[PDB]
Amino acid sequence: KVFGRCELAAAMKRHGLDNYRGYSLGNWVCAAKFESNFNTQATNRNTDGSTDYGILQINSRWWCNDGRTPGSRNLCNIPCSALLSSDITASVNCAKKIVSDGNGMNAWVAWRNRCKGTDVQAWIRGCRL
């Protein structure tokens, strides 16, 4: 599924991401835009052999099991394929674990390099929320 900006914002709000660990909704929408272009089916292979999955490009080295990343953990206890679903519940629940782990949204390289320190409220402007 390729979400619309406001459609994704409202989905993320319904799932409890607005101000989750202090990160306003526009941070999460900005991260999703630059990580996956709002596409739940996005995958990208990393140099170490791991793969990033879904709308928030969650890494198989730590967070999900894809059967082909030796020595990795599965801290969200899910198959990585679950992160590609049109239902973002699995991705949101896993993202809450990631952002709670200490480094906040710096876990998402695109957030650090393209959203941090910007007017992220702009990502939810105009949406009925």
Phi-psi bin for 37: left (phi > 0), alpha (psi -120 to 50), beta? left
What are the phi and psi torsion angles at 90 (to 5°)? Answer: -65, -40
Sites of contact with Na ion (CB under 5 A): 60, 65, 69, 72, 74
Nearest approach in angstroms of CB 74 to Na ion is 5
The residue (of 60 and 91) whose beta carbon lies closer to Na ion is 60
Tell me if 111 sits within 8 A of 30, measured CB to CB.
Answer: yes
Considering only residues 26, 50, 55, 84, which one is a binding residue for Cl ion as defined by CB under 5 A?
Answer: 26
- Positions in 63-82 near Cl ion (CB under 5 A): 69
> Six-digit token pair at 105?
């949204």
Tell me if 41 sits within 8 A of 56, measured CB to CB.
Answer: no
- 101 assigned ligand-binding residue: yes
Please give the residue ranges that form the binding site for Cl ion (CB under 5 A). Answer: 24-26, 69, 104, 121
Q: Which residues are annotated as a binding site for substrate?
A: 101
For the annotated catalytic residues, the residue numbers are 35, 52
